[PDB]
Design an enzyme around this catalytic site. Sequence first.
Site, PDB file in Angstrom:
ATOM      1  N   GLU A 155      -8.439  -6.446  -3.368  1.00  0.00           N
ATOM      2  CA  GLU A 155      -8.873  -5.158  -2.830  1.00  0.00           C
ATOM      3  C   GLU A 155      -9.993  -4.550  -3.689  1.00  0.00           C
ATOM      4  O   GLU A 155      -9.928  -3.409  -4.140  1.00  0.00           O
ATOM      5  CB  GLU A 155      -7.685  -4.197  -2.724  1.00  0.00           C
ATOM      6  CG  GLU A 155      -6.557  -4.712  -1.843  1.00  0.00           C
ATOM      7  CD  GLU A 155      -5.588  -3.625  -1.445  1.00  0.00           C
ATOM      8  OE1 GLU A 155      -5.381  -2.698  -2.252  1.00  0.00           O
ATOM      9  OE2 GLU A 155      -5.023  -3.695  -0.335  1.00  0.00           O
ATOM     10  N   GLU A 253      -2.409  -8.964   3.204  1.00  0.00           N
ATOM     11  CA  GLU A 253      -1.253  -8.114   2.974  1.00  0.00           C
ATOM     12  C   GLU A 253      -0.895  -7.302   4.195  1.00  0.00           C
ATOM     13  O   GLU A 253      -1.774  -6.725   4.840  1.00  0.00           O
ATOM     14  CB  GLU A 253      -1.518  -7.145   1.821  1.00  0.00           C
ATOM     15  CG  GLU A 253      -1.234  -7.680   0.433  1.00  0.00           C
ATOM     16  CD  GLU A 253      -1.558  -6.651  -0.634  1.00  0.00           C
ATOM     17  OE1 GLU A 253      -1.255  -5.456  -0.427  1.00  0.00           O
ATOM     18  OE2 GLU A 253      -2.113  -7.031  -1.679  1.00  0.00           O
TER      19      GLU A 253
HETATM   20  O1  LIG Z   1       7.995   6.741  -5.173  1.00  0.00           O
HETATM   21  C1  LIG Z   1       7.508   7.727  -4.239  1.00  0.00           C
HETATM   22  C2  LIG Z   1       6.061   8.105  -4.583  1.00  0.00           C
HETATM   23  O2  LIG Z   1       5.288   6.886  -4.822  1.00  0.00           O
HETATM   24  C3  LIG Z   1       3.898   7.140  -5.177  1.00  0.00           C
HETATM   25  O3  LIG Z   1       3.277   5.867  -5.385  1.00  0.00           O
HETATM   26  C4  LIG Z   1       3.104   5.483  -6.791  1.00  0.00           C
HETATM   27  C5  LIG Z   1       1.641   5.099  -7.014  1.00  0.00           C
HETATM   28  O4  LIG Z   1       0.819   6.217  -6.671  1.00  0.00           O
HETATM   29  C6  LIG Z   1       1.279   3.914  -6.124  1.00  0.00           C
HETATM   30  O5  LIG Z   1      -0.087   3.542  -6.348  1.00  0.00           O
HETATM   31  C7  LIG Z   1       2.169   2.745  -6.510  1.00  0.00           C
HETATM   32  O6  LIG Z   1       1.870   1.630  -5.672  1.00  0.00           O
HETATM   33  C8  LIG Z   1       1.856   0.350  -6.380  1.00  0.00           C
HETATM   34  C9  LIG Z   1       0.417  -0.130  -6.553  1.00  0.00           C
HETATM   35  O7  LIG Z   1      -0.317   0.883  -7.260  1.00  0.00           O
HETATM   36  C10 LIG Z   1      -0.214  -0.374  -5.168  1.00  0.00           C
HETATM   37  O8  LIG Z   1      -1.569  -0.839  -5.315  1.00  0.00           O
HETATM   38  C11 LIG Z   1       0.605  -1.454  -4.450  1.00  0.00           C
HETATM   39  O9  LIG Z   1       0.069  -1.699  -3.187  1.00  0.00           O
HETATM   40  O10 LIG Z   1       1.991  -1.001  -4.314  1.00  0.00           O
HETATM   41  C12 LIG Z   1       2.657  -0.717  -5.592  1.00  0.00           C
HETATM   42  C13 LIG Z   1       4.099  -0.297  -5.321  1.00  0.00           C
HETATM   43  O11 LIG Z   1       4.513  -0.858  -4.068  1.00  0.00           O
HETATM   44  O12 LIG Z   1       3.577   3.094  -6.324  1.00  0.00           O
HETATM   45  C14 LIG Z   1       4.001   4.253  -7.142  1.00  0.00           C
HETATM   46  C15 LIG Z   1       5.505   4.513  -6.941  1.00  0.00           C
HETATM   47  O13 LIG Z   1       5.816   4.510  -5.556  1.00  0.00           O
HETATM   48  C16 LIG Z   1       3.204   7.890  -4.022  1.00  0.00           C
HETATM   49  O14 LIG Z   1       1.841   8.164  -4.375  1.00  0.00           O
HETATM   50  C17 LIG Z   1       3.938   9.212  -3.829  1.00  0.00           C
HETATM   51  O15 LIG Z   1       3.321   9.939  -2.747  1.00  0.00           O
HETATM   52  C18 LIG Z   1       5.390   8.899  -3.453  1.00  0.00           C
HETATM   53  O16 LIG Z   1       5.394   8.088  -2.270  1.00  0.00           O
HETATM   54  O1  LIG Z   2      -0.607   0.452  -1.876  1.00  0.00           O
HETATM   55  C1  LIG Z   2      -1.936   0.878  -2.202  1.00  0.00           C
HETATM   56  C2  LIG Z   2      -2.732   0.994  -0.912  1.00  0.00           C
HETATM   57  O2  LIG Z   2      -3.945   1.778  -1.160  1.00  0.00           O
HETATM   58  C3  LIG Z   2      -4.764   1.961   0.038  1.00  0.00           C
HETATM   59  O3  LIG Z   2      -5.910   2.721  -0.322  1.00  0.00           O
HETATM   60  C4  LIG Z   2      -5.650   4.144  -0.517  1.00  0.00           C
HETATM   61  C5  LIG Z   2      -6.359   4.936   0.585  1.00  0.00           C
HETATM   62  O4  LIG Z   2      -5.857   4.496   1.861  1.00  0.00           O
HETATM   63  C6  LIG Z   2      -7.870   4.676   0.501  1.00  0.00           C
HETATM   64  O5  LIG Z   2      -8.554   5.419   1.525  1.00  0.00           O
HETATM   65  C7  LIG Z   2      -8.361   5.154  -0.879  1.00  0.00           C
HETATM   66  O6  LIG Z   2      -9.735   4.931  -0.996  1.00  0.00           O
HETATM   67  O7  LIG Z   2      -7.649   4.415  -1.935  1.00  0.00           O
HETATM   68  C8  LIG Z   2      -6.187   4.586  -1.900  1.00  0.00           C
HETATM   69  C9  LIG Z   2      -5.552   3.800  -3.054  1.00  0.00           C
HETATM   70  O8  LIG Z   2      -5.794   4.483  -4.285  1.00  0.00           O
HETATM   71  C10 LIG Z   2      -5.223   0.602   0.561  1.00  0.00           C
HETATM   72  O9  LIG Z   2      -6.013   0.804   1.745  1.00  0.00           O
HETATM   73  C11 LIG Z   2      -3.967  -0.201   0.910  1.00  0.00           C
HETATM   74  O10 LIG Z   2      -4.349  -1.495   1.402  1.00  0.00           O
HETATM   75  C12 LIG Z   2      -3.134  -0.387  -0.362  1.00  0.00           C
HETATM   76  O11 LIG Z   2      -3.932  -1.055  -1.353  1.00  0.00           O
END
Ligand SMILES: OC[C@H]1O[C@@H](O[C@@H]2[C@H](O)[C@@H](O)[C@H](O[C@@H]3[C@H](O)[C@@H](O)[C@H](O)O[C@@H]3CO)O[C@@H]2CO)[C@H](O)[C@@H](O)[C@H]1O
Ligand SMILES: OC[C@H]1O[C@@H](O[C@@H]2[C@H](O)[C@@H](O)[C@H](O)O[C@@H]2CO)[C@H](O)[C@@H](O)[C@H]1O
Length: 386
Positions: A155, A253
């Site tokens: 990504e 994904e």
């Molecule tokens: O647990 C509930 C809350 O989770 C928050 O999400 C956190 C991070 O902001 C989010 O980026 C992270 O996600 C992980 C990783 O960064 C992402 O790229 C990947 O796709 O998934 C990972 C986890 O599945 O997760 C944590 C903890 O959830 C939300 O921002 C908050 O609103 C609320 O949902």
């Molecule tokens: O689980 C992470 C999730 O992030 C998405 O991107 C979000 C949002 O939708 C975008 O508009 C923004 O620019 O970046 C945030 C992440 O910080 C992404 O589109 C998903 O595929 C996942 O990666």
Amino acid sequence: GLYVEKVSGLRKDFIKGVDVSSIIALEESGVAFYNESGKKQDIFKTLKEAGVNYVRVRIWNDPYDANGNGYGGGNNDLEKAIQIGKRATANGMKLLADFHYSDFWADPAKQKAPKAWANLNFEDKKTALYQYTKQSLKAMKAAGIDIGMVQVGNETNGGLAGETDWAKMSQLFNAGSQAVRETDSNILVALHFTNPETSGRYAWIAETLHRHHVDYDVFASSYYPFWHGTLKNLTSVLTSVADTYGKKVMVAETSYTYTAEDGDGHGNTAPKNGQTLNNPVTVQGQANAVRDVIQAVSDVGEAGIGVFYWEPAWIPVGPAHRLEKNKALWETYGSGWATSYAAEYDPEDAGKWFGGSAVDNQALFDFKGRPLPSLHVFQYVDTGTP
Ligand SMILES: OC[C@H]1O[C@@H](O[C@@H]2[C@H](O)[C@@H](O)[C@H](O[C@@H]3[C@H](O)[C@@H](O)[C@H](O)O[C@@H]3CO)O[C@@H]2CO)[C@H](O)[C@@H](O)[C@H]1O
Ligand SMILES: OC[C@H]1O[C@@H](O[C@@H]2[C@H](O)[C@@H](O)[C@H](O)O[C@@H]2CO)[C@H](O)[C@@H](O)[C@H]1O
Ligand SMILES: [Ca+2]
């Protein structure tokens, strides 16, 4: 009970993959997986019988602090990648090595350079990236792992390894590609992007990639229905790229919620207010969603090669009511999405959200490790339910 409507025009060699990178940490946390009959069984064997033919695994350079404490999120380094790769290949499934080129999660907002590359001039970082990719792939081949595809970045919508300038990113893409190319001509090189709903994004990226002479085969995209627009759009932007640049396309994904309940005590990613949920949050709904992504990708034509479900088995280490007892396991085995130990590397996000699984309600297995009927979508898309 389950119902899958046959995907029309689905090619017989369509890729059906899963990314179960968290599997190692979860098994060390004491989590177990079963099969239709209810007997403990290697998850990779259950996946194979389910018709899965591909396994994707994320790889972080050094997901640990100076003392060796895992950042969590599966603590996915090369070593666990080989572990996963061996089991994947021992069960007749090819591997998709997903290089984040970072010590932790890499997404649209995070593309931090690995601690070791922290302060290397661009030329050296490019060399390190190549060397790294080169060495990793070689170690995998040594383990006898059947590598079918390599993802150079994850990504990378706005950066890669601390780099944000597309001219430099492209050189990093080629550096990694270079390694793959030298390792095995047959391995497909894929670049992964997200947010296909964004007007013109993919078209711009594909054009930029072309103008900077990046050598790749697959234009990969993420597709989470609750954020990434319609399936009609997905098929549309991936077909543009396919037709205009002659690339293969796929979804690296995707997932969906089969229940609104949180199984481990750590708030989940979905379902939430404001998210688009075109399918009921149930097992059938979940199956529908996966079935439709496969359809959407398949509709691209000869260029649509497959779909990878993301984390179909990141189930809880324990019931939600044992949150505190759970936090222990997450912290010790990195079986949650992140551990407090990652605060040093990512204070902004992981720093204040570390904990357990944020996607247990999107698995194809229940909280107790049993496979949900939706797991058979992989098989049924070919024929449909009778
Ligand atoms: O647990 C509930 C809350 O989770 C928050 O999400 C956190 C991070 O902001 C989010 O980026 C992270 O996600 C992980 C990783 O960064 C992402 O790229 C990947 O796709 O998934 C990972 C986890 O599945 O997760 C944590 C903890 O959830 C939300 O921002 C908050 O609103 C609320 O949902
Ligand atoms: O689980 C992470 C999730 O992030 C998405 O991107 C979000 C949002 O939708 C975008 O508009 C923004 O620019 O970046 C945030 C992440 O910080 C992404 O589109 C998903 O595929 C996942 O990666
Ligand atoms: Ca959870």
